């Protein structure tokens, strides 16, 4: 039961060393690219956005896959929603004036200069071997034929969040209305994920703020009396998907699913189960089942709301085809109904 889950968590700890050295390598490449991007008049204000829950500037999206975001302070920004998509927007408003097409800031034009500067730069430093693979993420780098890092350019807006987020981040009953107000005072980000000229709202930087401050109790997981299993359930959900994707690699049925889908479902379960007593460490097996059952429901109903934009369906036909969702539904059901044989030794 839960002893199989606890065995999985123990095994995962054994690759901490490989992960930290890989993240060190990513960190070096990113610092170098940050230096050259700052030379360009367009990207002078660029900087690293702190998104990682364990490492600072580096998010781990899968084994040997890392995620980095470059933020660009762009003030006096005005948004125009693209055709009721709730998540995609035209950006309107001098350093960036080169990227204008009318009153609109072109995502494709800015991404193209971003790409070109990075592609130039990875040639020079022969300290490590870095190539460019493959539109968000802007750049995927492959380091040493092993480690891949997705680099995402993000405009930073310090304005109030767009109205499409008004009913999102539904944490009031869990983390309190006070915390939700404070979080909604932080900046938001636009990335050039095209629905073209459209940008997508991004709140990835909020994850670290909640995952490591995750209890109804302010001292959840700060002492021996308050140990919950929230983080371990998220780890197990990510590992479930990673393992399924590897086993179904012959026909790549699951290519479209990612840890972002897993995380979103997991934080919806945290909303539904707001009390720390619903995440007691002794209850790991039931808590994990809660998480998997909700993910299964999202798959079967083909509905997974963006955590911040409730009318944006991560599982829409526009984003993931029906056959892929039907397929993973079937595999998750099987795993859940059979006590997760994908976790067997
Ligand atoms: C509590 C909490 C906090 C943050 C997130 C979060 C949000 C986004 C987003 O789209 O705003 C994320 C992400 C994680 N990882 C990736 N993206 C992302 C970013 C841009 C485009 C597509 C995808 C979640 Cl799920 C829950
Ligand atoms: Zn806790």
From Swiss-Prot:
GTP binds at residues 51, 150, 200-207. Binds 1 Mg(2+) ion per subunit. Is also active with Mn(2+). Mn(2+)-activated enzyme forms an inverted pppGp(2'-5')A intermediate, suggesting a non-canonical but accelerated 2',3'-cGAMP cyclization without substrate flip-over. Mn(2+) ions are coordinated by triphosphate moiety of the inverted substrate, independent of the catalytic triad residues. Undergoes a liquid-like phase transition after binding to DNA, which is dependent on zinc. The keyword Transmembrane does not apply. Induction: By type I interferons. Changing residue 238 to R: Reduced enzyme activity. Decreased ubiquitination and SQSTM1-mediated autophagic degradation. Its main location: nucleus. There is a cross-link at residues 13, 119, 178, 208, 235, 238, 251-252, 303 (Glycyl lysine isopeptide (Lys-Gly) (interchain with G-Cter in ubiquitin)). Changing residue 333 to A: Reduced interaction with the SPSB3 component of the ECS(SPSB3) complex. Changing residue 218 to E: Abolishes homodimerization and subsequent nucleotidyltransferase activity. Abolishes stimulation of interferon production. Does not affect subcellular location to the nucleus and cytosol. Changing residue 16 to A: Strongly reduces enzyme activity and stimulation of interferon production. A motif (KKH-loop) lies at residues 251-253. 2',3'-cGAMP binds at residues 67, 150, 193, 200. It is an enzyme of class 2 (transferase). Keywords: Acetylation, ADP-ribosylation, Antiviral defense, ATP-binding, Cell membrane, Chromosome, Cytoplasm, DNA damage, DNA repair, DNA-binding, GTP-binding, Host-virus interaction, Immunity, Innate immunity, Isopeptide bond, Lipid-binding, Lipoprotein, Magnesium, Membrane, Metal-binding, Methylation, Nucleotide-binding, Nucleotidyltransferase, Nucleus, Palmitate, Phosphoprotein, Transferase, Ubl conjugation, Zinc. GO terms for cellular component: cytoplasm; cytosol; nuclear body; nucleoplasm; nucleus; plasma membrane; site of double-strand break. Monomer in the absence of DNA. Homodimer in presence of dsDNA: forms a 2:2 dimer with two enzymes binding to two DNA molecules. Interacts with nucleosomes; interaction is mainly mediated via histones H2A and H2B and inactivates the nucleotidyltransferase activity by blocking DNA-binding and subsequent activation. Interacts with PQBP1 (via WW domain). Interacts with TRIM14; this interaction recruits USP14, leading to deubiquitinate and stabilize CGAS and promote type I interferon production. Interacts with ZCCHC3; promoting sensing of dsDNA by CGAS. Lys-27 and Leu-35 residues are specific to human and destabilize the interactions with short DNA, shifting the specificity toward the detection of curved long DNAs. Lys-27 and Leu-35 also restrain cGAMP production and, therefore, immune activation, allowing a more fine-tuned response to pathogens. The N-terminal disordered part (1-160) binds unspecifically dsDNA and expands the binding and moving range of CGAS on dsDNA. The disordered and positively charged residues enhance CGAS-DNA phase separation by increasing the valencies of DNA-binding. The N-terminus is required to sense chromatin and its phosphorylation blocks its activation by chromatin DNA. When the N-terminal part (1-160) is missing the protein bound to dsDNA homodimerizes. This is Cyclic GMP-AMP synthase. The chain holds residues 161 to 521 of 522 of the full protein.
